[PDB]
Amino acid sequence: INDYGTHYITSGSMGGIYEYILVIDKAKMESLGITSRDITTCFGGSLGIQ
Amino acid sequence: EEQIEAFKSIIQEKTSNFNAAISLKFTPSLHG
Numbered sequence: 001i002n003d004y005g006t007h008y009i010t011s012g013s014m015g016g017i018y019e020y021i022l023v024i025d026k027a028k029m030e031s032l033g034i035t036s037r038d039i040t041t042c043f044g045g046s047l048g049i050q
Numbered sequence: 051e052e053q054i055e056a057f058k059s060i061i062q063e064k065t066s067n068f069n070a071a072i073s074l075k076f077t078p079s080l081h082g
């Protein structure tokens with residue numbers, strides 16, 4: 001079997017073959033995050049006795 | 051390709067004021 005093969009040819013075509021493949025993969029991922037916080041406190045007191 | 055950016059900004063302020071207006075005047079010779 002190893003010397004003469006597992007199969008033999010019964011018919012077919014003896015022509016040439018041209019197979020072209022153009023595989024293109026593109027990926028893009030973007031993530032933006034902005035956080036800003038402001039606080040303000042203002043307090044005063046006046047007391048006078050005369 | 052890789053790209054990253056980070057910005058930070060912090061500002062702090064604290065005012066303070068403290069008046070003191072006190073006067074003494076007395077007259078009943080005697081004077082103050």
Ligand SMILES: *[C@@H]1O[C@H](CO)[C@@H](O)[C@H](O)[C@H]1NC(C)=O
Binds near residue numbers: 046066067068069
């Ligand atoms: C003094 O009093 C005024 C009026 O109440 C106030 O605006 C000021 O902040 C006080 N303190 C100062 C001038 O240091």
